[PDB]
Write a protein that binds this ligand. Structure first.
Ligand code: HEM
Length: 397
């Protein structure tokens, strides 16, 4: 692997042989376009806990790339684009809404919505897990978190993908026009939700943000941008992970049987899915100062990508790392990051993946609806996710 490129077609559909080489021969690697790639668990964790590997250079590049106006002003304010102290401020505001305690309200909602999504599939004995389970579930869950009407999932998912794809460095004139068009409609939506809370009340996350705005801790734009942040990152990551999880279990029929026979293994089966095929393969940073790493000299202003996908396959951390083992000891992975930017939504994620996998393993005759090889990953670099995952089972469920 002379210069690693995640945009390469081979790497898009199975990056794991590239990773194996990387963490064995070049753990801190200068890849395509002079982007550094960090592979090993120890180093990934090192980078993520270091504020010097920052997001500000990425924000400024992106806002000047999209140009002046509503899109720049709103998406410019997103938490993913901030360093301290703005990052700490926004995280302090929304943080308490994501506690396991604060999220018990959603358990029956999420279990319930998995049921409702399975429901039209049962008599058919077939389903595309991506279209019909993964995406709606993830969108309904993050809407519930916010306190927004869960029936708006489609419209809001669309706005968020149109806006979100505008951060994808491989952009289009078409993507852009749609992004600018969707941010306007999206912003209206949120303002109408805020006004409803202004006049009616609420105890939801959107209400907690509106209150933070009143105490001057958060601007109107920051509320809108936080809403956009959660919906976009909240739904694509979870949806793709539900798909990957089901694939991981279908690919390993014996592991599926074990879980089916031993339902107590659900929690760690999910952990293993997160470990083995994470929907977020990597995260980007840009250095504010020279930093030394495994003898490599990474320069001020260099772009640095940490590979959560590779770090999860690190032999220094995991015995037989390339094997899918649901009975492995649940030892924390990199799938939710570390340090300052650790995943606020990890519990919400787990609740969804547990409910989705529980309901699907419970199905007699569960199998792939197509051939193993006909599967295809989505064209974007931002997440690892299937375009389609047809499954079949015994009609009746
Ligand atoms: C399986 C699904 C998910 C995966 C694999 C995942 C993964 C990650 C990772 C790796 C990070 C660290 C980002 C970095 O270091 O640059 C992160 C951060 C974050 N995630 Fe998640 N996540 C998932 C689901 C969710 C959900 C459901 C939400 C709720 C809306 C959420 C909200 C956030 C937020 C707010 C951050 C903070 C980023 C920052 O402070 O810059 N995530 N996630």
């Amino acid at each position: 692997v002379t210069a690693f490129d995640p945009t390469d077609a081979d790497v898009r559909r199975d990056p794991y042989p590239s990773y194996h080489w990387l963490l064995r021969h070049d753990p801190v690697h200068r890849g395509a376009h002079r982007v550094w790639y960090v592979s090993r668990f120890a180093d990934v964790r090192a980078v993520l806990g270091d504020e010097r590997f920052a997001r500000t250079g990425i924000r400024r590049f992106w806002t000047d790339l999209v140009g002046p106006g509503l899109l720049a002003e709103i998406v410019g304010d997103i938490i993913l684009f901030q360093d301290e102290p703005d990052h700490g401020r926004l995280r302090g505001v929304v943080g308490p809404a994501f506690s396991p305690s604060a999220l018990r309200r959603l358990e029956p909602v999420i279990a319930g919505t998995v049921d409702d999504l399975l429901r039209p599939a049962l008599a058919r004995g077939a389903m595309d897990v991506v279209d019909e389970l993964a995406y709606p579930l993830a969108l309904r869950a993050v809407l519930g978190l916010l306190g927004l009407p869960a029936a708006d999932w489609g419209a809001v998912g669309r706005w968020s993908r149109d806006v979100g794809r505008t951060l994808d460095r491989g952009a289009s004139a078409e993507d852009m026009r749609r992004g600018h068009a969707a941010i306007a409609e999206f912003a209206d939506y949120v303002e109408r939700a805020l006004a409803r809370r202004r006049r009616e009340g609420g105890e939801d996350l959107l209400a907690l943000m509106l209150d933070a705005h009143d105490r001057g801790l958060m601007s109107r734009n920051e509320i809108v941008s936080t809403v956009v942040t959660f919906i976009f990152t909240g739904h694509e990551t979870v949806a793709s992970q539900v798909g990957n999880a089901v694939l991981s279990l279908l690919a390993h029929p014996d592991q599926l049987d074990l879980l089916r026979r031993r339902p107590d293994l659900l929690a760690q089966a999910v952990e293993e899915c997160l470990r083995y095929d994470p929907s977020v393969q990597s995260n980007t940073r840009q250095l504010d100062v020279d930093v030394e790493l495994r003898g490599r000299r990474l320069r001020r202003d260099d772009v640095v990508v940490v590979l959560a996908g590779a770090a999860n396959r690190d032999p220094r951390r995991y015995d037989r790392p390339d094997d899918f083992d649901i009975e492995r000891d649940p030892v924390p992975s990199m799938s939710f990051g570390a340090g300052m930017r650790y995943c606020l939504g990890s519990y919400l994620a787990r609740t969804q993946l547990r409910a989705a996998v529980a309901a699907l393993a419970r199905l007699p005759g569960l199998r792939l609806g197509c051939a193993s090889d006909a599967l295809a990953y989505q064209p974007r670099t931002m997440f690892r996710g299937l375009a389609s995952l047809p499954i079949a089972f015994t009609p009746g469920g």
